[PDB]
Amino acid sequence: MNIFTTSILLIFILLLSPILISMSNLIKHINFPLYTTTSIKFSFIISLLPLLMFFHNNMEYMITTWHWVTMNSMELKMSFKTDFFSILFTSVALFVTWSIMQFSSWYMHSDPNINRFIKYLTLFLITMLILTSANNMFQLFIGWEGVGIMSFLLIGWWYGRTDANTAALQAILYNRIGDIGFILAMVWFSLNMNSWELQQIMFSNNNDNLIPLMGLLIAATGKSAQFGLHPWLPSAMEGPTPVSALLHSSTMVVAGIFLLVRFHPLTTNNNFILTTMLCLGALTTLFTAICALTQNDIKKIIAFSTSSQLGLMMVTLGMNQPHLAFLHICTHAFFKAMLFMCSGSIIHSLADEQDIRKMGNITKIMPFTSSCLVIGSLALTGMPFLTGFYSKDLIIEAINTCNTNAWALLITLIATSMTAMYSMRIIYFVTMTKPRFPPLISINENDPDLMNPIKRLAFGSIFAGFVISYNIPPTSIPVLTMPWFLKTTALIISVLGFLIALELNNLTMKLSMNKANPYSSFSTLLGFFPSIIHRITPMKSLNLSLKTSLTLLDLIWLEKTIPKSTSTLHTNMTTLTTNQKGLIKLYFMSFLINIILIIILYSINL
């Protein structure tokens, strides 16, 4: 209990060190990118050990480090819950951010504030590690908001671009909408349990706990991407490919699913939460893949695919398979980062163009990234053993083996096919056709800072599922008893999607003009969700803020009523009483009226 805890806190000390050199004067006399990358490397090597000790013993720990406050029977302290989830996610995220820092030192040259970029990356990593290892809702909220703000600071790197800022504020807005529910849950737990710690909160397994779960579900829809709060993730492609790869493929988007797995001891007995999960996550697998079938940008395609996979993980959460959802979280990062990686390689090789309609022959002009892209696409589709299988196969088996909703059970698979559809689209329009890009050619992918990270993430994407699934413990019994048309459905339908895509893409030839259609227009313009919501809701909110509150109430009526009325009244009475002309006759007649009134008062009351 000395080696485990020391190894747990050492990674935080290390991650902090760079930011300490960021305040010192050594930056201008150090290679900050290389130093930070080595820090991340050693942090990963350190985090590898707790993983071994857990795989061996299966022992979880709670570590309270510092007393912050004592509020009248309610303590608050720094508390880390080192469990399977935390210790595995830490290793995965560090192993990924290593590759990402290297590829960033490659991709962001000519940017003077590359030091600032690296600092922000490591700060986000720290916030995510807090979120992931928190044994306390307040610490988890710290991580939540740190992620949400690092997103604003990274989407916005190019603060002259008037669209990156719109995207940043969009993310802020949606994540605050999720924070609403997060705070609702925190309040319910603080009142009905006088605590904020998983330990005490786990004694509400018999209580009703529907309102806090609704709150957490809203927070998950927010931080992750689901049909109600999804659009901010595609609009996050306005930022550099490294942050698109870290904050939007592997981290900052599995946060809600991590929340729900941490709170799985309470969703196990609420068939209204599990049933809105299963009927919502599936509504995104379909609605985004559709969107990912007629978009022309590699980044947007990848983001929509990420959203679809997240819907799939929410589906397997609803079907009561939290460990499976988390296994997918962890086996998804490898290839959904290597894909952004090869995308950014292709882009920086060309003249900063992301539209597939102006690239081709990559399979021959750029073998390395083509091979890695194909590997990632296969792993994503579900090829029998490339880190996709070990999670997606079990998910797609449980989906049909459980008693479920028979429309989700269908659209989930339709989207699982659209996966291979748009993957084949990428493959065919970027790596199989003729070079419809400009004529000047300065391709170069022979830089180790680019070759080694992808090599590494590819070894990962190939062997991580094996290495994990054959070491983790069996916290759930699966069903290996079923017909062939359920045991092979994922593979079969991925193949059918590939073939349908081959056909419909070869039809892109044949000199037959492309008559626009409403289906494709819908899938292209996002179902118009943004185009309409982001135009009505602002208009109403703002026309109200202006014409009603500021104008009608404040600058008009709350003036007309109190102060202007006082002034009018007193000025009028002033005029009345000071309209006097110096006439002694009138003054004395008034004196006489006064005398009469006084005599009368006296003689009457008496």
Binding site: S73, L191, R535, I536, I556
Partner: protein, 125 residues
């Protein structure tokens, strides 16, 4: 066919005002452009002018702020639909929320008085 809306406006192509060749159109366009160019020349005789230590002012921005801020009450006039909008916006929601909260509080209090409630672990408020 494209049905315009106040949030998805009509383009310039489909605007029959465009393609109009009437002199009452082209003359007006020329005059508008002349005004625009006079203003741009005025502004560029200040931008690039050396010996300028300060910044450039914007009388249009000043007018806009003064209108949105201080020219409101001097032109305000009480009218029907104005008194009504004000009264509603000011009071209606307060009454709504008052009755919401009061119903909830009364219900909670009668429950507690009857003892029919479960306040397990509530030791903070």
């Amino acid at each position: 066919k494209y049905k315009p809306a106040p949030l998805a406006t009509l383009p310039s192509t489909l605007d029959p005002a465009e393609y109009d060749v009437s002199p009452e159109t082209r003359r007006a366009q020329v005059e508008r452009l002349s005004i625009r160019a006079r203003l741009k020349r005025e502004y560029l005789l200040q931008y690039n002018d050396p010996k300028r230590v300060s910044h450039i002012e914007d009388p249009a921005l000043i007018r806009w702020t003064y209108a949105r801020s201080a020219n409101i009450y001097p032109n305000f006039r009480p009218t029907p639909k104005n008194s009504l909008l004000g009264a509603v916006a000011g009071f209606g929601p307060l009454i709504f929320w008052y009755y919401v909260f009061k119903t909830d509080r009364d219900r909670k209090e009668r429950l507690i008085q009857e003892g029919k409630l479960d306040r397990k672990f509530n030791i903070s408020y």
